[PDB]
Design a protein around this ligand. Sequence first.
Ligand SMILES: Nc1ncnc2c1ncn2[C@@H]1O[C@H](COP(=O)(O)OP(=O)(O)O)[C@@H](O)[C@H]1O
Ligand SMILES: CCN(CC)C(=O)c1c(NC(=O)c2cccs2)sc2c1CC(C)(C)CC2
Ligand SMILES: [Mg+2]
Length: 331
Amino acid sequence: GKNIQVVVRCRPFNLAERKASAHSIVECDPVRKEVSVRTGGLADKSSRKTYTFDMVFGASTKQIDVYRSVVCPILDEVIMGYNCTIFAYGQTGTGKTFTMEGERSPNEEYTWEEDPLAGIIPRTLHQIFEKLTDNGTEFSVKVSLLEIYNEELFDLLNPSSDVSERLQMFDDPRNKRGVIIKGLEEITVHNKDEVYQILEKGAAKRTTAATLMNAYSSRSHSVFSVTIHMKETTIDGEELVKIGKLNLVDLAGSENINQSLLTLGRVITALVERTPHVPYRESKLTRILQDSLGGRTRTSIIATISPASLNLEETLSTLEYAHRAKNILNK
Ligand SMILES: Nc1ncnc2c1ncn2[C@@H]1O[C@H](COP(=O)(O)OP(=O)(O)O)[C@@H](O)[C@H]1O
Ligand SMILES: CCN(CC)C(=O)c1c(NC(=O)c2cccs2)sc2c1CC(C)(C)CC2
Ligand SMILES: [Mg+2]
């Protein structure tokens, strides 16, 4: 099979932390794939805790670094017609949204496709067209955005319906690890020049959900899906009907009421201790993502952490949680 791949990304210090002359309690060694955490009191004499992962990215890591090393190869596996999922897990403030979506460079310096602050989602969407136009390709791309807040479901892309309309989920008669979500719109991305405006209506729906729901950005989970239908007409006339799906999953903040977050953890524990009963059905998140958790999807986790000492307790919690998950076997 294939173990879940787990990478760590430490955010850099911000303006205020630099101004307070903050010293990092985290040391990342990408060559050894190690993160070392200062856990005791002192700085010239110190107990430390180290963890090995599949990859480690320190505070210096840029969006392009993450894209080249992590996204690209997974996108290739999607294009070869397989299912893949990437989770972002970590405490609020550590760069889950930064990693998955990214931000705009200030002062209108760049356009969306060349912005260095762009995260996984736009980079993926751009590259799918850039690579698939390049070869002989009859292909189609569809996106959806399903969000979970308090075990209720929301479509954050659909220009027709408004965000406050809850959706309903049902089991899928013709798919065992699968569900049907009534009212979730899949949107056809016809070409690379439709991408941004589709994202923009999403960004607007996000603001309304934040107005409607308490701490929505921290307590919600989003599942951004992109589906590629391929019948590549290369240069021979060949065409094999392959379908690839990519779920980009921005989890609710892990910091110490959230049934989906509680159930993800118990599912992970069941899977790693190989308990016969895995409680998938105990939350919306784990039903929707059942195949990503010990199923037939290639799954990666990006665990985000802080360099600051103030965050020590939550950083260790994140590291231990993520480390456990390396033992999950997928197919
Ligand atoms: N790798 C990074 N590089 C630069 N800034 C970052 C990084 N990770 C997080 N940040 C910053 O930290 C703050 C919180 O990041 P955000 O993506 O909102 O985290 P989360 O979604 O996990 O709460 C933002 O100001 C963001 O710019
Ligand atoms: C600038 C605001 N934007 C882009 C519309 C985003 O916040 C955003 C994303 N950002 C981006 O697409 C980019 C950042 C920098 C260059 S392009 S990806 C994404 C959203 C919102 C969402 C609800 C549609 C989910 C996926
Ligand atoms: Mg966030």
